[PDB]
Subunit: 123 residues, 4 copies
């Protein structure tokens, strides 16, 4: 449901995600990362699957953040693929891939993989 | 390099990606998969990092497709993270994560990881 | 150090890992998984990097479990790549890839990715 | 299929893997990488699942290499998870995770993911 996702979220690393989920399955917002070559907010764009889900199943969603804004250019993009679980303590569990632009030779070391969990605070 | 991301791309599996790259890093288009629980085109939205690149680096980009359209709703989303390379033979090399919405019991086995290489050929 | 790794470990899913770390960097043991197509123990084999690590850095290690024993054959193999952190509450943080043997056509859906954290109980 | 895993393999990067497959699922050998902070051969140990396969499935296998030998100690370990396919042109298709030992601060960026395809060519 767009509503429950829409809000301010923070993860275990201390980063901020402000997102608005549109009725058509769209997600737009700003991301603030507590770590890496990142300063201030960055635009985020993604999609979520408005599931009929009568199973107590999480909603599958994903978003990209290219790390370039008017103050910094990290030359990298992170995609998060995860599941949103609501209820009283709503969480978004994810796994992410962070690709940095590289030369052909160094492409084998371009992607980092990891996992983040977001806890919601405000709508 | 430059506007070269915009176009129609195909991966090893036969899927098609039609993207438009906006001047401030936005990516919009449609995706049609050749494999999996999917049918027709799907809306995709992403971002690419416009940058200086004296060393011939690729352009970092990424996009998401929630597999729900007017025909199917696979209850999943794939994100592709990768980089575009130009030249006579442009290509987008990516690694993707596909997450399906599971119940708590099955969360351990919710995410598939893989890799696709797209060319305009 | 071989010693601290050697012992009984359990993860958030409730699986057992009994391992003995050899001085040469070898790891052998039995794994008992609380989930998936698995029954009773399975042989595990891996390696760990006997780091001089004066930084409070984790020890990098990895191991494979092919899921075939005398009672079941799951036709799959899981590799865990992680870091061992000791101290009073020693943990092994990992990320894993689970590949199932597939036909050529279905190879794009052969690998699962996830992450497990093990808490130690006994040497 | 059968003992065909045993041999000398090479991946796209030019690395070499020499493995021996034991009858009860063990894998032993050496690995020499062509890229990264590595020098010479390294001990590898793994497992492969010996099975029935009426549908022409690959053989699931996996192995670990801790990048420490008498020459270097990169303080990391790579695990390859994948499957072997036989036929006139045998290949081992894998996805790998490389974890480096970080301090707590850097744990988020400790693991590289990638993919290699090995052939006896
Ligand atoms: N909140 C998070 N921060 C790190 C992880 C994945 S994205 C990452 C920060 C990256 C900042 C930009 C960069 O260093 O390239 N999640
Ligand atoms: N073009 C590609 N198709 C598969 C991979 C990445 S996503 C995938 C298709 C998944 C379809 C929907 C599903 O079955 O969940 N590349
Ligand atoms: N302790 C764990 N159990 C699951 C994860 C990764 S391995 C997995 C169990 C797999 C059992 C065999 C199978 O289902 O193929 N960790
Ligand atoms: N043959 C391959 N070499 C690279 C990939 C997987 S592991 C890697 C080399 C890493 C060397 C040690 C290091 O730099 O950490 N495939």
């Amino acid at each position: 449901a767009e509503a429950g996702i829409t809000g301010t979220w923070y993860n275990q690393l201390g980063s901020t995600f402000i997102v608005t989920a549109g009725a058509d399955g769209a997600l737009t917002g700003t991301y603030e990362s507590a770590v890496g070559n990142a300063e201030s907010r960055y635009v985020l764009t993604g999609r979520y699957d408005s599931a009929p889900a009568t199973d107590g199943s999480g909603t599958a969603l994903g978003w990209t953040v290219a790390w370039k804004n008017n103050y910094r250019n990290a030359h990298s993009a992170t995609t998060w693929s995860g599941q949103y679980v609501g209820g009283a303590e709503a969480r978004i569990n994810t796994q992410w891939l962070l690709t940095s632009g590289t030369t052909e030779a160094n492409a084998w070391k371009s992607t980092l993989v990891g996992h983040d969990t977001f806890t919601k605070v405000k709508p």
